[PDB]
Amino acid sequence: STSDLIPAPPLSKVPLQQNFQDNQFHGKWYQVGRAGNAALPQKMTAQIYELKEDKSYNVTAVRFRKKKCDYATMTFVPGSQPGEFTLGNIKSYPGLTSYLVRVVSTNYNQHAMVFFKKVSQNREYFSITLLGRTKELASELKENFIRFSKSLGLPENHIVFPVPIDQCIDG
């Protein structure tokens, strides 16, 4: 019925990891950081990336909800340039007309920063996630995650750091 979101930033303000290596990005990643213009404590979730033969990703989200492990699998389709992706079978997602994925930065074996933008029910949402190969990351990376977010118009109260857990995501 109604909603008010912080304008999505122009893509030019969103870097792209150069010479992106899709194979090395495969595997599990913990969501240590999450920022978004989305609606206003969160337990940590994980995202497993698997490179299919056709080089598109099978991404599985895993979270601990209501005492159970809830799984969700999406399909990331290589976009206009390496490190960028689009959502597969988008028509199976009610009211979703656009979905963009752009790997901002990553050393592949420790951390990554991913930028997400989508159009759902005509409302434009965007978000940045700080992923770590481990549930914990150096403060310096978190600080850089925080600065990046803010540089995109997002206030601190829109930047949360999920609390690490053991259930479902392995501990």
From Swiss-Prot:
Tissues expressing this chain: Detected in neutrophils (at protein level). Expressed in bone marrow and in tissues that are prone to exposure to microorganism. High expression is found in bone marrow as well as in uterus, prostate, salivary gland, stomach, appendix, colon, trachea and lung. Expressed in the medullary tubules of the kidney. Not found in the small intestine or peripheral blood leukocytes.
Residues in coiled coil: none
Localization annotation: Secreted; Cytoplasmic granule lumen; Cytoplasmic vesicle lumen
GO cellular component, one term: extracellular region
UniProt-annotated glycosylation sites, renumbered to this chain: N58
S-S bonds: C69-C168
A Pfam family: Lipocalin
Binding of enterobactin, residues: Y99, S127
Keyword Transmembrane helix: no
Keyword Ubl conjugation: no
Binding positions for a carboxymycobactin per the UniProt entry: T45, A46, Q47, K118, S127, L131
Gene Ontology terms describing biological process: acute-phase response; cellular response to amyloid-beta; cellular response to hydrogen peroxide; cellular response to hypoxia; cellular response to increased oxygen levels; cellular response to interleukin-1; cellular response to interleukin-6; cellular response to lipopolysaccharide
Induction remarks: Expression is activated by the oncoprotein BCR-ABL; BCR-ABL misregulates expression via the JAK/STAT pathway and binding of STAT5A to the promoter. Induced by insulin.
Keywords, sorted A to Z: Apoptosis, Cytoplasmic vesicle, Disulfide bond, Glycoprotein, Immunity, Innate immunity, Ion transport, Iron, Iron transport, Pyrrolidone carboxylic acid, Secreted, Signal, Transport
GO molecular function: enterobactin binding; identical protein binding; iron ion binding; iron ion sequestering activity; protease binding
Purpose: Iron-trafficking protein involved in multiple processes such as apoptosis, innate immunity and renal development. Binds iron through association with 2,3-dihydroxybenzoic acid (2,3-DHBA), a siderophore that shares structural similarities with bacterial enterobactin, and delivers or removes iron from the cell, depending on the context. Iron-bound form (holo-24p3) is internalized following binding to the SLC22A17 (24p3R) receptor, leading to release of iron and subsequent increase of intracellular iron concentration.
Assembly: Monomer. Homodimer; disulfide-linked. Heterodimer; disulfide-linked with MMP9.
Record family assignment: Belongs to the calycin superfamily. Lipocalin family.
Name under which the protein is recorded: Neutrophil gelatinase-associated lipocalin
Species per Swiss-Prot/TrEMBL record: Homo sapiens
Encoding gene, per UniProt annotation: LCN2
